[PDB]
Design a protein around this nucleic acid. Structure first.
Ligand SMILES: [Mg+2]
Ligand SMILES: [Mg+2]
Ligand SMILES: [Mg+2]
Ligand SMILES: [Mg+2]
Ligand SMILES: [Mg+2]
Ligand SMILES: [Mg+2]
Ligand SMILES: [Mg+2]
Ligand SMILES: [Mg+2]
Ligand SMILES: [Mg+2]
Lengths: 171, 114, 51, 48, 147, 183
RNA sequence: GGAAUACUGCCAGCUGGGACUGAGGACUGCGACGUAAGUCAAGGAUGCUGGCAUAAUGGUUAUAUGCCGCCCGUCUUGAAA
RNA sequence: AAGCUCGUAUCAGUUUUAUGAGUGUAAGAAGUCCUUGUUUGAACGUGGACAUUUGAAUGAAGAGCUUUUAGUGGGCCAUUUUUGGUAAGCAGAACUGGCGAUGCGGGAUGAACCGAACGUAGAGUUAAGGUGCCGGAAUACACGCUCAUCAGACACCACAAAAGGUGUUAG
RNA sequence: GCCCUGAAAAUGGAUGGCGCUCAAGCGUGUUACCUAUACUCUACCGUCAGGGUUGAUGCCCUGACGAGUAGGCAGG
């Protein structure tokens, strides 16, 4: 859906003579908290040897974008499952929010790589602070000074079946 | 290790009839060599009684009623104590309950992002 | 002879729950909470903003 | 069959006093009876 | 659809009505149905249940059996009730003085009871005398003795 | 609970709330082609038809039943408004093996007065806080016969997990929205 | 530093439009508004009004239109095959 | 189908707990306590007594015992375990589902595919599948890919060598 | 990832047809909408069950159910 970013902090259940287990925190992109907790337990079992029935969720908090009205360049480091193994991938997305950048990446994976949400892992989303560090041409072409471009061949949407005038595509 | 008729035993091998691994039965025949075990097996929609003959080393005493006997003794002791001193006593077993609330402090245990 | 829903029929609501009149009169469905000035800890803020 | 860890008891043995007997012992006895029968047949052939 | 746990439209059964066409028997059934409903009396329940049984399930009760039952201590003055036929018995030579209520009496049994000095009454007269079945003793005949 | 969360954040700690003691379960699939063990568990939980719902007290004995019937039910944690509306609109008692509408407090007082429950509000209280007589009150309540959701199920295919874009499994707090739609 | 708004949730908050239904047939009950007698939307529809008073509604019959519908019985897993 | 009894009676294609195996057993009147009799210990008992806090959860109003008789029996398909394999198909065991006896919605059409099981109707909402026209329902919105000298709208098996291409896009 | 080759016979025919190319194709996301003898509410028929009752195998009140070959029982 429309993605939201959460922090999930969990731990093992405290035991006798071994109190205060260490806390672990993950940043999870998900549509709701149920999916976020499911992803957290999945990744915790995949990385550490912690099971959901042996652990507990200490906290889950939504993380809002700090400056949602500022256009930013994002580098997204992801990995996906395959029969050969786990493959890295780096993409660059120009957007005003981390969650919208993640949604764009997921749509791009569904379109090109034929990938799925459960098979795509979001490893890192980092804002590119300097314009010189952007290294994809399809993003660099929008960083040029005094950028202008027209929108030729405009198609207007008619609410009526029949039109009494030949249409124009001017803009 | 002496087995008598009516004992509850577990069938545990130290090739044929591999279906009878982990089965629990009642001793009905005891010889100087082998032991006879009654097994109730599911056939269709009914249970049938079958006689199995086993070596002594391939069976052992089953402890499936040990918890029942110990719980009966503990219940008798607690009932005697609560009859001696008037108090409301709960004797039935209860399933595991959902846990209550708690406070988890980050006092030296600052959460670490993985 | 006929089932009437207390969620729609006010007479049946009052018959089943006498406290409904008090609830409506005191407007307990829109009770204001007392304003407090508690602030979260710096460790909580840093953890929330941490990557 | 003597070394077999588990022998199922035949249905036809029930109802007779030979139910308590070890089936391994019963089969060893049957084998020895067959061997002695073969020996008696050999002795009969030698007499004839 | 629904996943039924039990059979549907299952009859309770329990012998609701008698299979006979005797108008007098139906009148007795009516009277004891009224008594069983309006008294909450277990005696009336038992008599109503016995009035529905078939002939092979209502075996006869002998006068010698009645005398043996009256031989019990404290029962020498109770009213014997048999839902069925009371038959005579020539194997007994002493019969007590007592009141017996039954559906039918054989001629010999009625003569024996009257000669001993008691009375043979019907179930409606029993209902009038003891509406709740006070001081009554219900006797049933042997079942498995027939084959 | 709200202030305990705030006071924990001020002290640098995290307030972990107690686990839910109550769930509401709605059967979502029909009676054709159900495997025998889940079928038996659905009968034991009184979900004999599609869109039948019951309250379940959460223990280790009931969590495994819910896990067994997970592909065929939608369940979650009901709120006070959801429970109140369910009991008020679709609440029926089981009196002498008959389904009796709860249109007067005298019915509830006559049938559950031995347990200290005198009104429909007391019944709702015993449901929402799992008390000593939760079993008796819950079994007194006839299983709720819900309609189909008024706005639809919200998904193209129901019979996937709620996590994977379907309808079954544990949806936690969203069961309130679903049950209010189906009420 | 001071606010607002979005999102999620609650109200025994208010109010407009539309559709199907009116089972029951003296009273009894639970309630509400009322000092009060009484009143009520509270254990299932009443009130006011118009036209027609007959082929008008309705039925039957012949047909037209839209969609659905393979020829029965028997015997064979199974049958249009 | 008939009787007899009992009916907090009898239980359960389920879970939990304890204990086995790499699904089995057990969870109270077919109990328990004291008292010391039978062949200093096991195993059988004399007499008295404790209950509706009588021994986990959930569900269930019918359960048990005697009698008593109609129709039937070597079927197909599919899933999960397991043993042997063939050019390839597969063959032998264990268990469980669907169908025969069964209409309804959808998959254009259909023995085993998806949904759903059926008194007569009204209103509302849905499942699976769909919403250019046939055809009820957005020529909806949004992000990308593709141009096929008979593309594709498919069962996910095979052709298939993950082979060939100066097609195109992203890594 | 998508596209082309990756072998094809023999009456004229098939993504069901028409047709469709920033799709009416493919992957994915968010909503709205259509409609089953299914679900919810009501009425009516029948069956079963539980209560009441000094044309009584009738009458009154309440609740739940309704597929079916061989075969069984019951009322007509
Ligand atoms: Mg039905
Ligand atoms: Mg709608
Ligand atoms: Mg759908
Ligand atoms: Mg007309
Ligand atoms: Mg047709
Ligand atoms: Mg149209
Ligand atoms: Mg070929
Ligand atoms: Mg189409
Ligand atoms: Mg699409």
């Amino acid at each position: 859906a429309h993605f939201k970013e959460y922090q999930v902090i969990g731990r093992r259940l405290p035991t006798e003579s071994v109190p205060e287990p260490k806390l672990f925190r993950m940043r999870i992109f998900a549509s709701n908290e149920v999916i976020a907790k499911s992803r957290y337990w999945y990744f915790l079992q995949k990385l550490h040897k912690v099971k959901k029935a042996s652990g507990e969720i200490v906290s889950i908090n939504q993380i809002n974008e700090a400056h949602p009205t500022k256009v930013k360049n994002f580098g997204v480091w992801v990995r996906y499952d395959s029969r050969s193994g786990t493959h890295n991938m780096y993409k660059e997305i120009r957007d005003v929010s981390r969650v919208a950048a993640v949604e764009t990446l997921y749509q791009d994976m569904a379109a090109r790589h034929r990938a799925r949400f459960r098979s795509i892992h979001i490893l890192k989303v980092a804002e590119i602070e300097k314009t010189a560090d952007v290294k994809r041409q399809y993003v660099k072409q929008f960083l040029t000074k005094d950028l202008k471009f027209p929108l030729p061949h405009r198609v207007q949407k008619s609410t009526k079946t029949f039109s009494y005038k030949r249409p124009s595509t001017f803009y | 290790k002496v087995y008598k008729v009516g004992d509850i035993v577990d069938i545990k091998a130290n090739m044929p009839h591999k279906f009878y691994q982990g089965k629990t039965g009642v001793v009905y025949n005891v010889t100087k060599s082998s032991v006879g075990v009654i097994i109730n097996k599911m056939v269709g929609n009914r249970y049938l009684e079958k006689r199995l003959n086993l070596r002594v080393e391939h069976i052992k005493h089953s402890k499936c009623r040990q918890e029942f006997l110990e719980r009966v003794k503990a219940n008798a002791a607690k009932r005697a104590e609560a009859k001696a001193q008037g108090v409301a006593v709960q004797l039935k077993r209860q399933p595991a309950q959902p846990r209550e609330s708690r406070i988890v402090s980050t006092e030296g245990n600052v959460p670490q992002t993985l | 002879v006929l089932k009437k829903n207390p969620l729609k029929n006010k007479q049946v609501l009052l018959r089943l729950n006498p406290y409904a009149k008090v609830f409506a009169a005191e407007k307990l469905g829109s009770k204001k909470a007392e304003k407090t000035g508690t602030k979260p800890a710096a460790v909580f803020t840093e953890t929330l903003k941490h990557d | 069959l003597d070394d077999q860890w588990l022998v199922e008891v035949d249905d036809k043995v029930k109802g007779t006093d030979n139910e308590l007997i070890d089936p391994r012992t019963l089969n060893r006895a049957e084998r020895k009876r067959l061997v002695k029968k073969n020996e008696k047949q050999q002795r009969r052939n030698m007499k004839n | 659809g629904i996943d039924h746990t039990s059979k549907q439209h299952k009859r309770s059964g329990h012998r609701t009505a008698p299979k006979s066409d005797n108008v007098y028997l139906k009148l007795l059934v009516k009277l004891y149905t009224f008594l069983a409903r309006r008294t909450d009396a277990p005696f009336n329940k038992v008599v109503l249940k016995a009035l529905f049984l078939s002939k092979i399930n209502r075996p006869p009760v002998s006068v010698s059996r009645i005398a043996r039952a009256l031989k019990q201590e404290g029962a020498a003055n109770k009213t014997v009730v048999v839902v069925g036929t009371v038959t005579d018995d020539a194997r007994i030579f002493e019969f007590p003085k007592t009141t017996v209520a039954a559906l039918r009496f054989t001629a010999g049994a009625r003569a024996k009871i009257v000669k001993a000095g008691g009375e043979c009454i019907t179930l409606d007269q029993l209902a009038v005398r003891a509406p709740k079945g006070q001081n009554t003793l219900i006797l049933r005949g042997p079942r498995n003795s027939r084959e | 609970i709200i202030q305990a969360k705030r006071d924990a954040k001020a002290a640098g700690s995290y307030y972990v709330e107690a686990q839910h003691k109550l769930v509401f379960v709605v059967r979502i699939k029909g009676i054709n082609k159900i495997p025998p063990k889940p079928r038996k568990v659905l009968q034991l939980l009184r979900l004999t038809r599609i869109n039948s719902g019951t309250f379940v007290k959460v223990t280790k004995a009931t969590l495994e039943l819910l896990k067994l019937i997970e592909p065929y039910v939608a369940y979650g944690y009901p709120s006070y408004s959801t429970i109140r509306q369910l009991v008020y609109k679709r609440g029926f008692g089981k009196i002498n093996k008959q389904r009796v509408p709860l249109s007067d407090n005298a019915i509830i007082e006559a049938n559950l007065g031995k347990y200290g429950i005198l009104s429909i509000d007391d019944l709702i209280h015993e449901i929402i806080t799992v008390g000593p007589h939760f079993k008796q009150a819950n079994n007194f309540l006839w299983p709720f016969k819900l309609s189909n959701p008024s706005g639809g199920w919200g998904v193209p295919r129901k019979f996937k997990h709620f996590i994977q874009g379907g309808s079954f499994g544990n949806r936690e707090e969203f069961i309130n929205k679903l049950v209010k739609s189906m009420n």
